[PDB]
C-alpha cells in the first residue's frame, strides 16, 4: 500500500452512534468524497483503480461494533477474492493488529515489491515486523490473487526499460539534473496504479 494522511472527519458521521444505528442508515455518497480526497481514487490495500467501490471497515463491524462509525476505521476498498472481501469472508483466525493500517504506519517499512510482481517482506524484518508483513500479504491476498499479481507484474515490467535507461545516463550529466530527472519520474508514478511497486523499482533503496 501507500502512505495516506488520515483526512479530517466528514461531519456526516457525527449524527450516528454505534448500537442504535445500522450502517445502511448512512448515505454512502455523503462519506465517499472524503475517502476519495484521501486515496486519490485508488484502493487502500492494493492501490488498484477504484471502479467497484466499496466502503470498508478496517476493523470488522461484526466483531468491532463500537468502531462502526469511527472515522479512523473507514477505508475505500475495491470490490471478490482480494482485499476487504477476502479479509472478512476469505481468510480467518487473524488478528487485526497484525494488519498494516496504511494511515498510521509506513508501508515501505514492511513491504517490498520485486521486479517479478511478487511482494515479500522487506529486507531485515524480524519477529513482529515479518509477521506483520506476512499477514498483510495473506489476509488482503496481495499476491495469491492471480488477477492482482498479473496486473501488477505487467505494470512493473512496462517501465523496466525506463528504469534501465535512466540510471545508464548517470555519468552523462552532472548529478543535479539527473536528480531532477529521477524526481520527475517519481512524480508521474503517483498518478498510476500500484505506485508503491513502481517506486520500489525506481528508488535507490
Amino acid at each position: 500500500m501507500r502512505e495516506l494522511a488520515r483526512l479530517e472527519r466528514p461531519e456526516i458521521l457525527d449524527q450516528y452512534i454505534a448500537g442504535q444505528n445500522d450502517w445502511m442508515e448512512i448515505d454512502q455518497s455523503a462519506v465517499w468524497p472524503k475517502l476519495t480526497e484521501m486515496q486519490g481514487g485508488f484502493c487502500a490495500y492494493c492501490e488498484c483503480r477504484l471502479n467497484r467501490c466499496h466502503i470498508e471497515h478496517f476493523r470488522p463491524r461484526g466483531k468491532f461494533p463500537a468502531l462502526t462509525f469511527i472515522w479512523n476505521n473507514l477505508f475505500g476498498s475495491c470490490g471478490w477474492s482480494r482485499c476487504g472481501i477476502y479479509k472478512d469472508n476469505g481468510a480467518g483466525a487473524y488478528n487485526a493488529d497484525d494488519l498494516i493500517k496504511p494511515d498510521e504506519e509506513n508501508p515501505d517499512d514492511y513491504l517490498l515489491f520485486l521486479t517479478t510482481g511478487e511482494v515479500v517482506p522487506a529486507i531485515g524484518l524480524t519477529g513482529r515486523a515479518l509477521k506483520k508483513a506476512q499477514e498483510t500479504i495473506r489476509v488482503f491476498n496481495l499476491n495469491g490473487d492471480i488477477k492482482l499479481f498479473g496486473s501488477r507484474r505487467t505494470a512493473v515490467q512496462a517501465i523496466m526499460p525506463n528504469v534501465e535507461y535512466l540510471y545508464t545516463l548517470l555519468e552523462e550529466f552532472d548529478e543535479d539534473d539527473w536528480n531532477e530527472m529521477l524526481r520527475d519520474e517519481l512524480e508521474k508514478i503517483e498518478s498510476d496504479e500500484y505506485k508503491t511497486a513502481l517506486k520500489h523499482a525506481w528508488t535507490f533503496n
Binding site: 477474492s81 521486479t115 517479478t116 529486507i123 498479473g150 496486473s151 523496466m160 534501465e164 535507490f204
Partner: protein, 436 residues
C-alpha cells in the same frame, strides 16, 4: 402475428428481410433466444443467462454447467422441430433421473426460455419441466411451430435451423425435412452427408447445392484446398487424400462444417445466398482437436461463413477468446456455491489482447506453471541479489549459472537476470555516491 394467424398473412412476417451493404442478408424479424432460466436443474438452484443475437461464449472450470446449458437449450429446441415436422410432435422430455438438482425439496425442475421473433412476437415463453405433478407450458411453442409448418405447407418458407454438435462429433436423405433427423442428437449425421453428396454428384438447382457446401469446406476448413468424389477424395495439405484418410480433428472440423452446410442449405431453399439463414447452433468445445494456429482462426472463419446464425459456444481455449468481444464472453465465478443467480461479461477487453493477458485476467491461471520449481528461480535470484546491497554474490552467481544452463544463454530469463544485476549494482553505486 398470432392474431393474423387466427385471421400475405404471416408469410411476409417470416420471409421479409434486407441485405446489408456488406452483402449479408438480415431478416427483418430476427429469431434468436434472449433469456434462459433454470430452476433446480443439475448444479443450479436458479440461474438466468442473457444471450446476444450474434455470439455467446460460455467459459469456466471443469463442470460448471457449460454443457448443461446447451443440453437444456437443445431439449427446449426439440419441441420446435417436432411440431415443425408434424402436428403434436410432443418433442422431448427432460431426464426424470439426471436433469433435476439432487438436493432440491421441490423434487421438480423447470427450464424457462424466451425466443424473440421480431417486432410481433417480442416474447415466446417456453417452460419445459419434469417431476420425480409438473407439466410444460409448451403451448406457445407449439403455436409458433404450427404457424411455421402450416405456412410452409401452403407456400414453402425458410425454416429455422437447429443443431447441437456435442462431443459425439468424433467417434431418405433427399427430402428437405430430413434435415431435422437427429439434429439435436449431439453429432451430425456425417454418413448422411456422404450419401447426400454422392447422390448430388450422381444426379450431376442441385448443382448450386453442391457448390455452396463445397465453398463452405474450401473457405472454412484451412487444410482442404478442394473436395470431390470418385468415394470422396480431398486435396489435403497440398496432395490428394481419401476422406477416411483425413486427419483427426481435421476430419471432425470437416464433419461439423459439412453437416451444418448441408442441413442449412436444405432448410433454406429460397435464399439467394443460403448461408445467411436463420437458426440457433450449439457447439461444445469449439477448439476440439484444433492446433492453436487454427484456434485463432476457427471462430472468425466460422462466423464469416454463417453470419446471422445465432451461435452459443463453449470453449476452454484462451487463444479462441482473443477473437471475441468482451460483451460476448459469459463466465462463471471460479468460487461459487452453485446458487449464483446470474453471470456476466468480463472486465477487460479480450478482442485483440495478448494470450498471456487473457490466460490470467479472464481464465484465472498463472501464466507460468507454479508447480514447476524452475519457474521460481528469477524470484529467488532477485531476492538473493538485493539481500546484499544489490551487487553480485556467490550464491547469486550460482543461481545465475543455473539459469544460464537451464534456460540458455540467449533465453529471455537470463537477459532479465543480467539486467537485474546491472541495474541493482548501479543503484548500489548511486547509494555509495549519495553516502558521501
Amino acid at each position: 402475428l398470432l392474431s393474423a394467424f387466427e385471421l400475405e398473412m404471416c408469410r411476409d412476417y417470416i420471409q421479409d428481410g434486407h441485405v446489408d451493404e456488406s452483402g449479408i442478408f438480415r431478416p427483418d424479424n430476427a429469431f434468436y433466444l434472449r433469456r434462459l432460466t433454470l430452476k433446480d436443474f443439475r448444479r443450479f438452484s436458479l440461474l438466468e443467462i442473457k444471450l446476444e443475437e450474434d455470439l455467446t461464449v460460455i467459459i469456466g472450470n471443469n463442470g460448471k454447467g457449460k454443457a448443461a446449458i446447451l443440453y437444456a437449450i437443445a431439449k427446449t429446441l426439440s419441441w420446435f422441430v417436432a411440431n415443425i415436422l408434424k402436428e403434436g410432435g410432443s418433442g422431448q422430455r427432460l431426464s426424470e433421473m439426471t436433469d433435476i438438482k439432487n438436493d432440491a425439496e421441490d423434487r421438480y425442475s423447470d427450464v424457462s426460455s424466451t425466443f424473440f421473433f421480431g417486432k410481433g412476437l417480442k416474447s415466446v415463453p417456453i417452460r419445459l419441466s419434469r417431476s420425480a405433478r409438473r407439466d410444460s407450458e409448451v403451448k406457445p411453442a407449439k403455436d409458433l411451430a404450427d404457424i411455421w409448418r402450416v405456412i410452409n405447407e401452403v407456400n414453402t418458407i425458410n425454416l429455422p435451423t437447429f443443431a447441437l454438435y456435442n462431443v459425439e462429433r468424433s467417434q431418405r436423405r433427399e427430402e428437405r425435412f430430413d434435415a431435422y433427423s437427429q439434429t439435436l442428437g449431439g453429432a451430425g449425421r456425417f454418413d448422411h452427408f456422404v450419401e447426400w453428396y454422392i447422390y448430388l454428384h450422381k444426379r450431376t438447382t442441385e448443382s448450386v447445392q453442391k457448390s455452396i457446401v463445397e465453398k463452405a469446406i474450401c473457405s472454412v476448413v484451412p487444410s482442404i484446398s478442394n473436395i470431390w468424389v470418385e468415394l470422396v477424395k480431398v486435396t489435403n495439405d497440398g496432395h490428394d487424400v481419401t476422406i477416411d484418410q483425413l486427419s483427426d480433428g481435421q476430419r471432425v472440423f470437416l464433419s461439423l462444417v459439412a453437416d451444418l452446410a448441408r442441413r442449412m442449405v436444405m432448410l433454406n431453399p429460397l435464399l439467394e445466398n443460403p448461408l445467411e439463414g436463420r437458426g440457433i447452433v450449439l457447439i461444445d468445445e469449439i477448439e476440439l482437436h484444433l492446433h492453436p494456429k487454427w484456434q485463432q482462426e476457427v471462430i472468425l472463419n466460422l462466423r464469416s461463413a454463417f453470419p446471422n446464425i445465432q451461435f452459443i459456444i463453449t470453449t476452454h481455449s484462451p487463444i479462441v477468446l482473443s477473437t471475441i468481444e468482451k460483451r460476448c464472453i459469459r463466465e462463471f465465478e471460479p468460487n461459487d456455491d452453485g446458487d449464483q443467480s446470474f453471470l456476466d461479461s468480463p472486465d477487460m477487453q479480450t478482442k485483440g489482447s495478448e494470450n498471456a493477458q487473457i490466460l490470467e485476467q479472464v481464465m484465472n491461471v498463472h501464466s507460468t506453471p507454479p508447480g514447476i520449481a524452475e519457474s521460481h528461480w528469477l524470484g529467488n535470484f532477485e531476492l538473493l541479489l538485493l539481500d546484499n546491497s544489490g551487487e553480485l554474490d556467490n550464491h547469486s552467481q550460482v543461481l545465475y549459472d543455473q539459469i544460464k544452463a537451464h534456460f540458455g544463454i540467449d533465453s529471455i530469463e537470463l537477459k532479465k537476470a543480467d539486467s537485474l544485476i546491472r541495474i541493482n549494482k548501479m543503484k548500489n553505486k548511486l547509494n555509495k555516491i549519495r553516502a558521501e
